[PDB]
Amino acid sequence: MLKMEAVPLRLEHRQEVIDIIVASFYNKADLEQWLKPGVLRTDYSDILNDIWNVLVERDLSFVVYDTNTDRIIGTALNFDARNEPEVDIKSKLLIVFEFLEFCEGPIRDNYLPKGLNQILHSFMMGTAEKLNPRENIACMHFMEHEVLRVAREKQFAGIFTTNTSPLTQQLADVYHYKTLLNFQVNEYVHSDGSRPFGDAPDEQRAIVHWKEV
Numbered sequence: 591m592l593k594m595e596a597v598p599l600r601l602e603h604r605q606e607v608i609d610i611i612v613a614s615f616y617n618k619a620d621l622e623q624w625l626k627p628g629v630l631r632t633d634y635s636d637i638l639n640d641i642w643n644v645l646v647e648r649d650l651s652f653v654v655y656d657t658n659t660d661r662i663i664g665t666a667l668n669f670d671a672r673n674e675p676e677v678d679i680k681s682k683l684l685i686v687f688e689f690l691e692f693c694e695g696p697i698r699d700n701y702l703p704k705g706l707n708q709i710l711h712s713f714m715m716g717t718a719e720k721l722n723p724r725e726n727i728a729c730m731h732f733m734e735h736e737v738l739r740v741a742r743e744k745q746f747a748g749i750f751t752t753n754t755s756p757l758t759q760q761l762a763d764v765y766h767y768k769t770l771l772n773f774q775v776n777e778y779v780h781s782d783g784s785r786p787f788g789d790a791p792d793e794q795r796a797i798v799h800w801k802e803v
């Protein structure tokens with residue numbers, strides 16, 4: 591049985607967190623697959639490197655250790671939704687973030703509580719590549735449990751995330767996240783009139799989830 595411990599993010603975790611996020615997203619992420627070609631592994635690591643110091647300073651993020659091997663198997667990256675760094679993104683990931691803001695912005699700024707320390711934004715999650723399905727499932731349950739604990743302990747009102755894969759969408763639902771938007775990703779229109787995810791099947795959704803704590 592997999593037994594785990596959540597440790598707050600520290601400055602020396604940078605490369606381990608990057609390796610997990612890159613391995614967890616590059617050529618796997620459900621939105622970026624439609625921007626091919628031109629999704630580079632360094633596009634993800636460039637973003638994390640720009641935000642790394644503030645990410646650690648805000649003290650809302652954590653890694654998950656396997657306490658039997660003392661190695662990191664997962665990580666949850668969080669910010670206050672109203673107090674997030676903005677990075678100029680020179681990569682094609684900028685369209686993903688603009689799409690996510692298209693989903694989140696209207697809901698966040700007009701329907702969720704105003705002020706800082708209200709909305710805990712679950713920004714990225716990931717698990718190590720070598721985890722088998724039992725370990726992956728267990729680590730995701732452990733990270734969801736721990737995001738809730740951080741939210742309560744840090745006195746946030748709730749947890750806000752856009753879930754873009756079927757697994758994270760279904761996990762959100764069994765953890766009783768409320769659906770605020772279920773958007774068909776192939777209908778999103780970029781500023782140049784194109785549809786960057788237009789080739790995606792009609793069934794691929796971006797679901798904006800919210801859970802009060």
Ligand SMILES: NCCc1c[nH]cn1
Nearest residue numbers: 619621686713752754
């Ligand atoms: N949490 C938003 C899902 C996502 C996709 N790509 C990057 N992030």
Ligand SMILES: [Ca+2]
Nearest residue numbers: 712751753758
């Ligand atoms: Ca999520």
